């Protein structure tokens with residue numbers, strides 16, 4: 001059968017574009033699919049727009065093309081209380097005219113549209129043009145089951161979710177501690193709550209849902225999404241675990257971090273990074289600085305100014321005391337390259353799924369320090385279910401983590417026999433992930449099943 005054309009729509013931000021590009025890459029190379037990426041961007045001045053200028057919009061063999069789609073300016077449509085979830089929904093809504101015309105001009109219409117979590121409002125455009133439409137859930141199956149079931153919790157639960165004193169029971173799935181609810185569930189009176197319940201229903205309107213997870217990681221929740229009688233009252237279409245999708249390493253030979261790592265022993269270094277979406281209070285940054293020093297472990301720490309020469313933000317004499325023990329890297333690092341280095345033995349992260357996937361596919365265990373979005377659910381999975389992470393006694397967003405506990409966690413993970421058990425479990429998940437993505441593996445098979453659904457709908 002002849003070539004399929006699939007357009008994938010990314011919402012604004014590198015955090016959304018990159019996984020879309022990774023999916024596009026996998027579909028064009030291993031699945032004979034011609035890919036168009038519709039990369040919705042902000043009006044101006046984005047890390048994303050800079051990326052798109054430095055990179056080429058098309059590849060050698062004309063199998064992938066990136067079409068930047070700039071949104072309009074939304075600053076007049078928001079205020080200081082407007083949450084990120086709401087802002088993303090609004091940026092895509094405002095780009096719908098330009099998404100519509102972009103698709104209209106495509107003489108060879110796409111055989112299918114795959115849209116981001118934050119692009120489900122494109123659904124009526126797919127309808128209008130008679131294009132098969134699928135959505136891509138860029139994080140765990142557990143969080144997908146929450147979004148879809150939330151419309152039930154909304155009618156069955158009277159007050160704030162955060163005030164419940166019993167787990168929320170997702171049929172057939174892990175029960176959810178009220179402390180761990182995703183961000184939009186923290187305040188039902190906020191606009192983003194209703195937007196989130198709406199999203200959970202919009203999933204149901206698609207022809208299928210791709211998930212950035214794999215069968216062996218979440219067998220219970222995937223099986224529930226497929227067959228559980230209560231969830232299937234709500235979800236009528238298949239799910240496709242096609243992950244874990246992760247960006248490729250792009251080397252920089254003269255990278256001083258990599259040079260410093262090259263001189264360390266195997267699996268001896270704690271990488272500490274809260275990414276771009278992460279900041280700590282002044283008080284928390286001080287405790288983290290002291291915990292790292294007190295641990296006497298090797299570390300690489302990506303530092304950013306705190307929020308209530310990086311020397312101003314560290315304890316007096318920090319860089320002198322920790323010379324030879326630790327590297328303080330300012331603002332940014334090649335994270336995927338660092339996590340693949342043989343000297344890295346642990347990762348203190350916020351548990352964003354992209355970061356988690358980059359860690360697990362390198363077999364690196366974690367200290368789970370969730371901050372926002374769906375990270376508390378990710379952290380709960382990594383520590384309670386998967387056994388590849390340790391964590392503070394109390395959520396960092398509830399209580400200050402003190403230097404003593406941080407010292408103790410770094411030690412447990414990097415020195416004790418317990419930490420070695422956690423590292424071995426992470427090495428097993430690395431293999432599970434590799435198997436899933438291999439030819440004939442579960443995520444490979446799920447892509448073939450997706451392609452069959454697309455073809456079937458054109459008969």
Ligand SMILES: COc1cc2ccc(=O)oc2cc1O
Pocket residue numbers: 084085139143144182183184372373374
């Ligand atoms: C803080 O706003 C966010 C909330 C959620 C919730 C579930 C999810 O799967 O992703 C999210 C991404 C976000 O930026």
